[PDB]
Structure 1
Amino acid sequence: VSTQLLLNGSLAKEEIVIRSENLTDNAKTIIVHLKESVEIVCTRPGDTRQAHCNISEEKWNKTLQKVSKILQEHFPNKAIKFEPHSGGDLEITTHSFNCRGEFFYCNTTKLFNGTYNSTTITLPCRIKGNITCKSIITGLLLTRDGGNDDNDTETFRPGG
């Protein structure tokens, strides 16, 4: 499947588990399971196709710092940076989902803007009344970029 976030899924009871077929390799999709969910509400007021997605900054801004800490346990003495999707089509680059009879496409660039070291984020979307989906993020789909760049700043991207 070609998404980025997991809506209405399962939660890792204990803590945060990293699961992949080959962590030493970069081509294989990384699927990190979380414990505490994060609220993501995408409303569609009404351009008319332009929507948004309110997501508390702090919650998200923390559920990447701890996420780095676990990644650092799989990559010794290496920084962990998060950067947006590098895709060529709307379906894969943006957070797409079927919300009450409509497919969305959220420019989720603001979610992955810089390194994380230990208000409300609004994401523009694509496609008359007021629609509202109330899902919760249980996990993340990531994809590491290999190559042994010597800055040792492991860049991660949401994809598959």
Structure 2
Amino acid sequence: VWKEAKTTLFCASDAKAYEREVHNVWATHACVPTDPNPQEMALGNVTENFNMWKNDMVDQMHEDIISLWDQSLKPCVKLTGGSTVTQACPKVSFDPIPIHYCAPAGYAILKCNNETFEGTGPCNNVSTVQCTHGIKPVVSTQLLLNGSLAKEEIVIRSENLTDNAKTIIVHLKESVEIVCTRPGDTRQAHCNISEEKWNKTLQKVSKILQEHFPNKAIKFEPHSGGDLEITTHSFNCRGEFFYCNTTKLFNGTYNSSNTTITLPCRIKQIVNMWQGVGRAMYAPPIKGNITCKSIITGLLLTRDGGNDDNDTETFRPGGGDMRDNWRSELYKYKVVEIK
């Protein structure tokens, strides 16, 4: 039923009328309640092409989450170039909820059921839905949190792998739990990840990469540089902005009483806005244990360029553009027209 088109999709999610939590309050006005019995329609001997990297759904979602954060997470000061705005910045309750994107009347959404699909090119098992699955709008860098998981094997996605300026998205099959805590210096926090889980997952990622880069040695190293937002694994927990050193997660070659990796984190109040150009200053953190038990379900990587002896290909954590975070979940979808 391929008829790629552009329409304004509408959001849907199960918000609570009583909930003062910011994603809920936003969803209360922006979205509609979830269809209890959503219909899927299969398509036999039907094969169509997708491009996750050129998809209008990603941009719509991006605009929504931007306008969500703008209403919900009010900073004390917002400084932009030479201008400045200062409003009241009360503390808020914060925990993302799953948002569904849906096609209006006359249109529909194509779901790709090729569970080994790399995002671009032809797809053999295709069906039609009216809404995508539940997507948590988790804003983060380096690590993709609380996402869906690859269901057959680890998938590597890139618009062009040979193009070192294109972001690489790893979609994990087995999730790794990450627990972050600020104990009740009060700006210092720390993350905890198991070595067994993490080591193993990078071993497994090394193997898949070896297939895409034959006769090359695969090696992971820490971030090359830039703003703290992207040189650390940064993410928001319960309103507070965490910044975690991921050096220990990337320690070279991954060959083929449990022991944990402790990543040192800091809570910041002076933050670069991911929405756009600007520095935002938020309120000092709340008291007590501030804790997030999340799951790592994907990575953002960037491959090293330039001439290489030793036949070694080096990968580093990426991130920064959040559109990437959304396409890691919207890759299997395209918006079509009916005729």
Indicate whether the TM-score tops 0.5: yes
Distance 1:2 1:142 in 2: 13
Q: Which residue of 1 aligns with 2:313?
A: 154
SS of equivalent to 1:80: strand
Q: Distance in 2 between matches of 1:88 and 1:6?
A: 19
**Aligned partner of 1:140 among 290, 293, 299:** 299
Q: Conserved in 1, the CA contact under 8 Å of 2:191 and 2:263?
A: yes
Q: Secondary structure at the match of 2:198?
A: helix
Q: What are structure 2's unaligned runs of at least 5 residues? A: 1-138, 269-287, 318-339
| TM-score when normalising by structure 1 | 0.94
- Quote the offset at 1:24 in angstroms: 1.1
Q: Structure 1: which 5+ residue stretches go unaligned?
A: none
Q: Distance in 2 between matches of 1:2 and 1:87?
A: 17
1:110 match: secondary structure: helix
Cα drift, residue 4 of structure 1: 0.6
In structure 2, distance between residues paired with 1:152 and 1:146: 12
| Bigger Cα displacement from structure 2, 84-93 vs 114-123 | 114-123
Runs of 4+ in 1 over 3 A off after TM superposition: none
Q: How does the TM-score come out when normalised to structure 2?
A: 0.45
Cα deviation, residue 88, structure 1:
2.2
Residue 2 of structure 1, CA deviation = 6.9
Question: How far apart, in 2, do the equivalents of 1:87 and 1:40 lie?
Answer: 23
How far apart are the structure 2 equivalents of 1:110 and 1:143?
A: 17
User: Which whole-Å CA distance do the structure 1 matches of 2:165 and 2:140 have between them?
Assistant: 15
Contact 2:174 2:297 in 1 (8 A): yes
Which structure is larger by alpha-carbon Rg, 1 or 2?
2
Asked which structure has the greater RCO (Cα within 8 Å, sep 6+), the reply is 1
How far the C-alpha of 1:92 sits from its partner, in A, is 0.7
C-alpha displacement at 1:58, in angstroms?
A: 0.8
Contact preservation (8 Å) 1:40, 1:55 = yes
Aligned-residue offset at 1:9? 0.7
- Could you say what the CA RMSD is over the residues aligned between the two structures, in angstroms? 2.2
CA separation of 1:152 and 1:82: change in aligned 2, threshold 3 A? same
For residue 89 of structure 1, report the CA deviation from its aligned partner.
1.5
Q: Which sits farther off after the overlay, 78-87 or 113-122?
A: 113-122
Tell me the equivalent position of 2:225.
Answer: 87
2:206 is paired with a residue whose SS is helix
